[PDB]
Amino acid sequence: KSEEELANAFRIFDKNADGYIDIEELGEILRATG
Amino acid sequence: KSEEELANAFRIFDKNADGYIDIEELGEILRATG
Ligand SMILES: [Ca+2]
Ligand SMILES: [Ca+2]
């Protein structure tokens, strides 16, 4: 890091390219974490 | 409890009250803590 890794992760999840994450996208993050 | 659980996690992270998550907040999720 220095943000690069996270910026890419953000992007991968940020399917609808809005510079954000939403509820289903958050679902897709929180997937592994029960 | 599923669906509703996701809403809570979302909300815990979604400090700035936008119905989204941003990079720092994503930081707080991707905090495995560390
Ligand atoms: Ca998005
Ligand atoms: Ca937010």
Q: Helix, strand or coil for residue B31?
A: coil
Yes or no: say if B15 and B29 are a contact pair by the CB < 8 Å rule: no
Q: Helix, strand or coil for residue B1?
A: coil
Residues of A in contact with B10 (CB under 8 A): 23, 26
Chain B residues contacting A, CB < 8 Å? 6-7, 9-10, 13, 18-23, 26-27, 29-30
Q: Helix, strand or coil for residue B18?
A: coil
Tokens in use for B25? 């907040």
**Shortest alpha-carbon distance between residue A17 and chain B (Å):** 12
Helices within chain B (DSSP H only): 4-13, 23-30
Q: Helix, strand or coil for residue B21?
A: strand
A18: left (phi over 0), alpha (psi -120 to 50) or beta: alpha
**3-state secondary structure string across chain A:** CCCHHHHHHHHHHCCCCCCCECHHHHHHHHCCCC
What are the C-alpha distances in Å from B12 to residues A6, B17, B31? 19, 10, 13
With an 8 Å Cβ cutoff, are A21 and B26 in contact? Answer: yes
Solving technique: NMR
Which ligand sits closest to the CA of B15? 2
